[PDB]
Each structure stands twice: as structure tokens, then as C-alpha cells.
Amino acid sequence: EVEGVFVRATVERRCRAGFCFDKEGQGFADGVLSDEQLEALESDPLLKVERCTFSG
Amino acid sequence: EVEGVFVRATVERRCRAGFCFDKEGQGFADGVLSDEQLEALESDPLLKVERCTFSG
Amino acid sequence: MQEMGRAAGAHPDELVFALLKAGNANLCYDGQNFFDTDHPVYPNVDGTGFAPAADPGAAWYLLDTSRSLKPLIYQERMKPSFTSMTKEDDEQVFMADEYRYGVRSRCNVGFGFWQLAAMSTEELNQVNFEKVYDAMRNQKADGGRPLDIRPNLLVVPTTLRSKAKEVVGVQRLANGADNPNFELVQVLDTAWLN
Amino acid sequence: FAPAADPGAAWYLLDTSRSLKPLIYQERMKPSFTSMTKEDDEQVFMADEYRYGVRSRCNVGFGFWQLAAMSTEELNQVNFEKVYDAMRNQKADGGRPLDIRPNLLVVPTTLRSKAKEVVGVQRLANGADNPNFELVQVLDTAWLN
Amino acid sequence: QFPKLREWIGQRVIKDMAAQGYQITNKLFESTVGVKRTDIEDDNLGVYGPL
Amino acid sequence: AIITPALISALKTSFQKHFQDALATAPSTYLQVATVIPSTTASNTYGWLG
Amino acid sequence: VDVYGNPIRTQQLREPQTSRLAGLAKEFAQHPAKGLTPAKLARILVEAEQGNLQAQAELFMDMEERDAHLFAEMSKRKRAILGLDWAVEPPRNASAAEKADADYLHELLLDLEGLEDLLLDALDGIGHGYSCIELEWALQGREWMPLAFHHRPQSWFQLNPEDQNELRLRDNSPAGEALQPFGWIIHRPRARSGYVARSGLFRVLAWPYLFRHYATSDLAEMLEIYGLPIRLGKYPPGTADEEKATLLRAVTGLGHAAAGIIPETMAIDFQQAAQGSSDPFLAMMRQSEDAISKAVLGGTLTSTTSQSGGGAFALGQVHNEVRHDLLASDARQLAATLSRDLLWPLLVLNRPGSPDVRRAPRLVFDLREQADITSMAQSIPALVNVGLEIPSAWVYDKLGIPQPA
Amino acid sequence: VDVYGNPIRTQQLREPQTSRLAGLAKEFAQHPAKGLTPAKLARILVEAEQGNLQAQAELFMDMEERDAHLFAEMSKRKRAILGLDWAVEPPRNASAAEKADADYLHELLLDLEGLEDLLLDALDGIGHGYSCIELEWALQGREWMPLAFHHRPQSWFQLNPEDQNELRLRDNSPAGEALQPFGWIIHRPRARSGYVARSGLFRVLAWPYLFRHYATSDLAEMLEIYGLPIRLGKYPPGTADEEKATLLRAVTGLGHAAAGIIPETMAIDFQQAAQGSSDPFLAMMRQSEDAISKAVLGGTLTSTTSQSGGGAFALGQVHNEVRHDLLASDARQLAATLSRDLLWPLLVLNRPGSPDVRRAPRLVFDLREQADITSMAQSIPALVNVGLEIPSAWVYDKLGIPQPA
């Protein structure tokens, strides 16, 4: 099981091309790959964040 | 590198074919592999010990 | 240090019971194995064979007597004084020394080679327990006289402790029939053998 | 069903627990949370726990029994006394014994009476005998199975 | 544990000892119940408060 | 959150030296079956005349 | 039986308990103070908390030996006790038989050689947290006697796995061996409330000792480097190995040698060696020494010295606060230990009957403080002329003068 | 029953309450002082406020052990009490039966061994905020006796979830276990008004301890770095790995080695290592130590020392302000706790009837201050010749001289 999910329509910093804008991607508290990119992508939320059990 | 050889022209206990002998200087100190069997092979330097690393 | 001390303190039991294990192989003063079927008490033949040992332990001497020569003096190598730290990466050595050895007191006051079991009142209980008991009761010495042995010790491995307790400790043996050996020989646990 | 033979007098106890933090009381009373001003008049009461069990010694624990008491030669003599012999025959490095002294028997409520019969009555289940009377004291429980 | 005390003939074997370090993490547990603030006071039999 | 709790395991983990020396030898038994014969020689010998 | 009620058997008194442990007498201290770092000290203390007192005891012995200030303080503190007069008194409102028992015990202690050594050995528990003295029991006919007192190193004992306040001998077994009744005089002074492992004063004093040791070693090294400056020689390309060695020897000996000559193509640069002062090191040493003085003897006379100043009440001023309190505490604890361990076996072996434990005689140290004779001698006549009937017993007791016989 | 009115059952007195909690006796302190930061200390204190006293108790024990100045101050303060003479007095205008009860209790306390240890263990509550001593009750026929006093660590208790002033044992349950009546002597001195968790003096002293610890560790590190300067070697392109290692070893050993030679193409620069003084660190240590002295013993004799100066009134000057107040407060609180916990069970078990609680005897410590004999002895004759009839009882009581018998 993976612990870590953000499902409150919450905002996170995801960078597409030359800018970082609101979007929900990985949104997990565990990492095995893309750690250096995840840091920029996984900036903790701006707004209310609540976690669930995807169990994927 | 090699942490240690502990040869002094003497192994600890090289047991083969059901008989345990003392020769060939096969002493190692590392957990690369066969640690469980490394306990049996090692752990009995009857004679003096001389450590001369081979830098392998 | 304390671990080695406790190991040394335990050592005498290991020595005694290693000799007990080797009793079927080691030789008593007669010239035959301690537990052998051909003890030369006379021009005739006398015999005493899970390596148990029924013992009386009541005569002036006990079987497998121990010999404490030197205590567990601790031996240590924790100072640069030695060539272990010279030739090697500061290898200290901790040791304990003993100077003892086991003994074979008398092979005419012990018995082994048991097909132990406690199924039937006698037909399986006297198979070994009573054969040892009566043999010792009637062991003869020089001059054709009984040794007046009083077997009251029974040493068996851990696996046989339940059967030994059943033989000595319960009125019935295994079928609610009888047990002639109740409160006859007191058994003691041991795992150093087998 | 769900057996386990354990020592109790050893310096270690099997299945050791870990009371890492106490039974701290977590509460939601009034102007301490938002559930009560910018929300309904809701209050939650919680008990936080931060503990976990341990698998301490797998060389002294025995399980998977057909725990039974009958005939004093095939059911108990070959299962419970088999466990007795196995536990007391455990050998450490160098071939020395572990000094295993099985004195704890843990079983669910379903096996309580039969465990009591194994330990507590001179006769097992047919009037033959009971070698395991007053050798292991059984404590009943229901948390398992 | 130490190796068994062996026999002495000509020289002493400087044996070694093993180690079986065991790792196990921690887990977190919780149980909570949501109740209405007004209801706990709105009682006369002293119930719904001890809960 | 934290980027890599994977590497911070070494610092967090504590030590519980409860399994250290949590064992002992079997109870002494040679006393019941064997008798001590203190000696100070290299090869003790016993003599009996029958 | 003993005070604790444990059954007493006179059979075991013929031989010391440790006689059958000849392994202990052949051991040598491991000297864990050499090469000691703060991490090593923390590990030693933590392990001692768990029942491994050998390393802690050896470290404490090394600490006592290697620190002159700490050793002087401890020796002064112990010699304070060793110089006190002592007496054995009968219990409250004792009867004639009890008075006779107390008198006989007093006579026996007076004629018992080695009492001072026993007190000195017992006082080691102040710093080590516990001191064990083995007894040799002998029979000169019908009366048991302590033949001698043997002080056994604290490294010979450990903690019971099932009890953190009970000491046991090291007999190679995990649980050790229980202490024989009537075979020891265990002194365990209690400076702080806690278990026996944590009760030593050296546990408090360890860290200042390490601070002082580090400061002194660093100062010694810096004094060694002081003097000449480090000077580095430089050579151009095409300097052979022989010329390199000659330049190196010239640089090496240049500091001692006033003058030297080199080619213009070479160069020697004199760089600062060690520039500073002894102020930081000495500040640390003074801080540690003051801490040790306060912890051992109080921060009124040793660290923050009371300074000079005589007078009739000067004795009281110097003593009563701090010095008298510490003296009385140590003396009372030692007296309680002695009355428990040595007086009771003598009473219950050397005399008939089974006297109740609550009525046993108690050893008392003379803590009487010198009172100003002149001022009080001036004072009495006025009071007696007024009409007060002051008892003479109070006067004789307080002045130290004995009552007429 | 007890003073609080809770029913008392003699059945539960045969065994200690904690006997059925064998798990507690096997625990070891976690030593939370090692690696302690201000955030960790704040979390520890806040958690203790909420009923987690284990970490706070262990931290306090470590703080006591690791600070020599604080330990010396606390030991001096406690030894001040331990040296006071005490007596048991009957209630106001007591009757003959009450006087007999008080006399019997006094005799019992005199002959009760371990009283000093009990007082020392109880005084731990001054710093820890609460001290619990377990009682062992035994029957020597028809009269109950306290067999021994056992001090249990403060880490063994917690706070009641429904009451922040009531302590309970740790029995693995959320609510703990209520303390058995007549099974404990709980001493809870009150320096500040508040709950039990916040009532300890070590809670006040924690922050200065951390300041001093940080300053001392930083000073030790800076003393370690002091001495030689850091020097950096530079090499040109085309220097192989072997030459790099040779240059590195040369630089590493250059500080100890007076002289060395390098190629002109290389360079070594000696940079400042640590330049400053011990003044800031020592200033912080002095500030913290003064704060600790003021908090423990008052800012008139310890921190801002009263200095020397004798005289007849010197005793009063040194004592009455600050020292006498603190001594009297501590002694009175300890006496109240003892009279509540130990005297009452003895009275209600060892004697017949059900005496009223308000008339129970009270233990009193001797707080009498030495009065100038000479000045007052000069003074009386004038007053008595004038005509004043001064009672002799006041004189005998105030001088310490006993009345004739």
C-alpha cells in the first residue's frame, strides 16, 4: 500500500514548461523514482489537503 | 580492496569431503557472500595470524 | 568477559557428559568399554550393555567422577603488549583455561543401551528399567558376592524425560494397568547427551 | 487451532510488546479546533497509540498443533509431548542446549477445556494416563481466532 | 554465544561469534468517535458523557 | 512531508539491548551423578586392592 | 539471624565466599580511562546503568589516580571522618544487660586492630557508590572474631538482572552470586536518590574530569608546538633528489641554526606556528576544578573560599553551614552501616540469647563542636545569680569535660 | 481510616501494591538528556503537562546527574534538612491519653531504622515536584510495623485523565491505577501554585541547565580546534593522484612538523583557525550558574554571596532572611507530609480506639535558632533588678537548656 494522497482539489506546484502552476500529480508521501523532479513537483499543498488509501 | 587475508600460510578450517583440514590460507574478513559458510570456514586460526591485504 | 566466565562455569558438565556419551566407546579399568557386554569380572562373561546411565550414586564413589584441576582463570589479550595487535588490526583476545578431565569410576556399577518405553506394566517397562535394576542388584565381584548396588539415579536425554517420569512418578504406566517402578529411581533432566 | 508453547521464567518473554508512548487522551472540546465554530457543534474524542509487537525468539516458540488428548500414545503423546521434546531439544550454536523450559500454554477459548484436560487431570481421555499433568500451566484467552 | 570449550592439544583456535540483529518498525493506531457538543449536556441519566 | 525518509533510518532507529545474553546454560547436573576429586598433578591414579 | 532476617548458618563462616572463585584474584584492571572520549564515557555510564559495573569501577579508579585536584579533595573529605572520635552507646533507656552488651562491644572494637583501615575502605563507597569489605571469621575458643577485613574491588560485582538495587558476585553466570550473610560490610552512601549504579559521586564528577583532561592535553600540545615558527622551503624545477634532501635538512635545522645560505632561485617562508594564549585552556581548567570542589566539599569553603578571619564564632561560621552538614551526614551513614554489619554479628554470635533487633547498640561518632569556653563561662554566673537552675550534665556534655567519677 | 477518609482495609497491607506489576521493576531509564535541543525540551515539558511524566522524570534525573553545580546546590539544600533535630509533640492542650499516644509514637520513630533515608527520599520531591515512597507493613504479633521504605522512581506514575492533581501507577491501562491507602508516603512540596506537573523546581531550572550545557560543549569544541592553523595546499594541473596524496599528507602533518619543502609550482596558505576568546562562553556559564543558585538557595548567600564578617548577630544576619525562611518552609512541609502519612497509620493501627483526626500528634522539626547567650545574660540582671518577672520557661526554651527534672 502507498500512504500519501491529496484529494481535496488542493493546489500543488507542478512545473510544465518554464513555469510552475497549480496541478495534482504524484501527490504521494513515498518516493522511489523522480525524487529530484518530485521535489519541485511535490511541493506541499497550498490549500486544504486530505489523504486516502488508493492501495494501488 | 580486500579488508584482510589473515593467511600466515594457514587457513582457519577448510573442511571438505567430510574431513576438516588446515591449509591453503583461505581467510577472509568481509560480508560479500557466504557469510554463514564464512563462519564455518573461518573462526579457527589455530596458528598465528598475519593480515596482508591484497587490495583486490 | 562475563559470557566467557559463564561458559567456563558450564564447562565441567559438558566434560562429564561428553565422557558419559563416550562411555560406550571409552574403556574402564578392566580393559573393555565402560558400557560393554563382555566385562571380564571372571573367566566367565559379565555384561552391562539413547546412552542413559542408571546409577546408584550411593557407594563411596559416584560414576563419571569429575576431577577439578584448575579453576576458570580468565585469559585476556587486551593490551598492545602482544604480537596480535602488532601483526593485526588491534585484535584483542579473551580466553578461559581449564585443566580438568572426566573419569570412568567403575563400569560394573552402570548400564546403558536402553530400548526405553513405558507401554505395558512390565513387558515393556522391565525391558530396560528392571533389567538394569536387577542386574545391578545382583552384580558380582571378586569372590562371587553381590556388590549390593542400589540404583537410584536415572539420567536420560530430554526426549526421554516424559517416559522416565511416567516410569517413575505415576502409579499406572501407559494403560491404567500398573507401574512397579513408582518412586524407585529419581530422574534428572539433561540435554548435553544426544 | 491456535496453539503456542512459550517460556515464562526466561530472561526474555516471547512476543514482547512495546509501550512506546502512553495511552494519551486526544480531545476536541471548545475553541481548540475549527469543528465547533466554523462547522457544526461536533466534538471528537480519540486515543492515540504508537505501539507494536515483536517476533522475539522463533527458536523457542512452537505452533501448528493438532492439539488433542486421547489414548496417551497417539494424540497427546505424539503432539503435545512432541512439542515438549522439540522445545527441550533445541540446540544453540556449538550444539549446547537453550535451557528451554516450556511453562506457558496459550490457546483460544475453544481449546480451553481440552488444554485443562492435558494439564490438570491425571487421566487424559480414556483412563490410561496423563504424563503432562502440572507441567505447563495454561492461560485462557480469546484475542486470537 | 561462545563456541563450546574444546579440547587442548597443541594450539588454541581463536574462534569468533555471530550476531543476529533484528529490525522491526513501529505502527500507529487510533480510534475516535464524533459527538455533538450540545447532546452531552442535554442528558439527565449521566450517559453519552462517559463514552 | 519529507523527500527521502529512506536514508534517515540510521539516525532514527534506537537500541534495545534486551535480546543480549537472554540465554543461559542448562542447570548443573554432574553433582548428582559425579563426585568431585580435587587434584594438583598431571595424571591422577587410583588404586584399590579388591 | 541478621538484621534483614535472612537465616544465618555458622558453617559457611569458616571460609570466605570468594575463596572458591580463584579466577577473580588473578584479574588485572583494564584501564578504560586511557584514550577516553565523550562518546566512550557515555557508553560506559549507560552500560553501567544496565549492570556492567566492571568498566565503571575501573574508570573511576583511573579517574581517582589521574586527577590530582579530585584526589586531594576526596582524600581530605575521607580524612575528615577518619579523625573523628567514636563511641558505642546502648539503646534508649537500656537495661543493665543491654548496658553490659554495649560495654563489651565497645571494648571489643577498641581492641580490634585494623578499624581505621576498615573505615577508609568503607568510605570509598562515597565516590564509587558502594564498597564491599569481606570478613574473615575465626574462633578463639568459644567466641567468634573478625580475623581481618579485606576490601574487594568494585569491579568484582554486578547487578541482579531481576533487581537493580541488589549486588552480586561475578561467578561467570548470568545471575552472578548472592552475597553471603555476615560475610561482608557493604557501605552504600546515598548522595542522590536512585539506584546503586547511579548513586556514585564520580558519576557526577566524570564530565568535569574529562573537560580538564582535554584542556590540559591540548595546552601541553600547544606548548610543545610553541617556540620556533614553521618555515617552508621552495625549490625550482630541475632540483635533484640530493639537493632536495639538502634543502629539507637545512629547513629542518634552520630554526635552531641562526644563519644559513640558499641560492637566489630558492625561497624559505616563515609562517605562524601557534599564536594565541593559555587563557581559554586555563579558564576551562578553573571552571572544572571549581565544579569538582563544589560537588565534593561545597561551594562555601573550597571553590568560593571562605577566606580568612578569626574570632570566637569563626569556628561555627566556617563549620556549621556546609562543613558540619557534610561531616555529620557522612559520619551518620558510616555509623549506621557499621552498626548494621559489624556490631550485630558480634552481638548475636559472641553473647547468649536472642536480643530484639530494635534494641541493638548503635555506634555513634563524636560530632561535638568546640564551644566557646570563655563567653559561656562569663554567661553562667549571671544566670545562676538570677536564679536559673541549669543542670551540670548539660554543661559537662557540651564543654567536653567529663563528669566526676 | 486515613486522614482523607478513604476506607482502610488491612487485607491489602500484606503485599505491596506494585508487587503484581513485575513489569515495572525490569525497566531502564531512556536518558532523554543526551542530544537535547530547546525544541525537544519544550516538547518534553508540554507532554509532561498532559500526563506523560516518564520523560520528564528521566530528564530531571539526567539533569541532576550531569550538572555539578546544580547537584551541589540540591545536595546542600537537602543536607540542611537532614541535619535538623526533630520531635513529636501532642496536640494543643492534649490530655493524658493523647500525651501517652504521642510519647509512644515518638519512641517508635526513634527506634525505627531508615528514617534518614526516608527523609532523603522524600526531599527528592523538592526538585521532581513529587516523591512516592512505598511502605512494607509487617506484624510482629499484634502491632503493625513499617518493615522498610522503598522509593519508587517518578517515571512509574502518571496523571489521572479526569484529574490533573491526582497521581496514578502505570499499569498499561489508560487510567493507570489509584494509589493504595496507607501504602505510600507522597511528598509534594509547593514552591509555586499550580498543578503537580508544573510544581517541580527542575522545571524552572531546565533552561539555565541547557544554556550552560550548550556553552560548555561549544567551549570544549573551540578549545579542541585551537592551536595550529588550518592550512590549504594548492597544486597545478597535471598533478597525479599519488602526488596529490603526498601533498595531502604533507599538509596534514605540516602543523606538527616544523619544516617542509614543496615545489615552487605548489602553494600552502595558512588561514585563521579560531580566533576569539572564552569570554562569551564563560559569561553565559556564570549567568546560568547565578540563576541556578538564586532559584535553589536564594540570591543573598549563594549567587550574590553574603561575604565574610563575624559577630554576635552575624548568625541572624546570615540566616533569618532567606536561609531561615527556606529552611523553615522545607522543614514544615516535610513534617506535615510525615504527620499525614506515617504517624497516622501507626496511631490508628497500633493503638485502640478511633481518635479524632484533628487531635492527631504532629511531628515537629527543631527550627530553634542559636541565641546570643552573653548579651542576653548581661541583659536579664538589669531587668530582674528593675522588677520584671520574666518566666523561666521562656529562658529555658529559647536558650536550648532543658528544664530541671
Numbering used by the authors:
A (entry chain bK), B (entry chain bR): 53 to 108
C (entry chain bQ): 103 to 151, 160 to 304
D (entry chain bL): 160 to 304
E (entry chain bL): 52 to 102
F (entry chain bQ): 2 to 51
G (entry chain qp), H (entry chain qr): 5 to 409
Original paper wording:
A pentamer of major capsid proteins on one of the capsid vertices is replaced by a connector complex formed by twelve copies of each portal (gp32) and adaptor (gp41) proteins and a hexamer of stopper proteins (gp42). The asymmetric reconstruction of the capsid–portal interface shows the symmetry mismatch between fivefold symmetry of the capsid and twelvefold symmetry of the portal. The portal complex is surrounded by five hexamers of major capsid proteins. Two major capsid proteins from each of the hexamers contact the portal. One of the major capsid proteins binds the portal complex with its extended loop and peripheral domain. The second major capsid protein, which is positioned counterclockwise when looking at the portal from the inside of the capsid, contacts the portal with its peripheral domain. In contrast, at the interface with the portal complex the N-terminus of the major capsid protein (residues 2–14) turns back and forms a short α-helix positioned parallel to the extended loop of the neighbouring major capsid protein, thus leaving more space around the fivefold axis for the portal complex. The reduction of symmetry from the twelvefold of the connector to the sixfold of the tail occurs at the adaptor–stopper interface. Asymmetric reconstruction of the JBD30 virion connector complex contains double-stranded DNA passing through the portal channel.
Bacteriophage Casadabanvirus JBD30, from the order Caudoviricetes, is a temperate phage that infects the bacterium Pseudomonas aeruginosa. The virion of bacteriophage JBD30 is composed of an icosahedral capsid, long flexible non-contractile tail, and a baseplate.
